[PDB]
Amino acid sequence: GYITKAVDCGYDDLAQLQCSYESFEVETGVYSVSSFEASPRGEFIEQAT
Amino acid sequence: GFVVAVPTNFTFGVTQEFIETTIQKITVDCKQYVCNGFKKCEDLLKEY
Amino acid sequence: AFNKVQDAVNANAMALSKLAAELSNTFGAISSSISDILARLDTVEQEAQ
Numbered sequence A: 001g002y003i004t005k006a007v008d009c010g011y012d013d014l015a016q017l018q019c020s021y022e023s024f025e026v027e028t029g030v031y032s033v034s035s036f037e038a039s040p041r042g043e044f045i046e047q048a049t
Numbered sequence B: 001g002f003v004v005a006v007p008t009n010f011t012f013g014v015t016q017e018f019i020e021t022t023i024q025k026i027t028v029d030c031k032q033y034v035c036n037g038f039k040k041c042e043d044l045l046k047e048y
Numbered sequence C: 001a002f003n004k005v006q007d008a009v010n011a012n013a014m015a016l017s018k019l020a021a022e023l024s025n026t027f028g029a030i031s032s033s034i035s036d037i038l039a040r041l042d043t044v045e046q047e048a049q
């Protein structure tokens, strides 16, 4: 019942692969992956007077 | 005996035919397709 | 040619696990269990969940 291992899914690209396919054993290949990074945003406001 | 129709002249005829061997390969980013990077959408998608 | 013997065993088992896993989804309801929807809501709100 104890958590044995974990993966931070935004650290590098192997971690994005493991979290995008939701498994720890990944079976040699070439894979397309998703993004799990935060990347804090800004603001672009432009209205007329 | 019997009658047989035997050729006395000929040509060469060409039949054309297409056989498909492959399709276009596509991978989809499912998270960006469904939720467009919104955290409120991504918590509602865990229920499915 | 031996890897196709195992990929039929895996295909037989992947069909059965996609049946049992759709019973723990809530699909946007308050719970994945009918006996909990019947105990927390009233008769007009039970039918929508």
Ligand SMILES: *[C@@H]1O[C@H](CO)[C@@H](O[C@@H]2O[C@H](CO)[C@@H](O)[C@H](O)[C@H]2NC(C)=O)[C@H](O)[C@H]1NC(C)=O
Residues within 6 Å of the ligand: B008, B009, B010
């Ligand atoms: C088989 O058929 C072809 C075509 O029907 C004949 O070729 C013709 O020959 C004459 C005389 O040489 C020419 O005037 C025509 O222009 C030819 N036609 C074509 C389309 O090439 C050929 O002679 C025939 N063979 C026999 C043994 O009868």
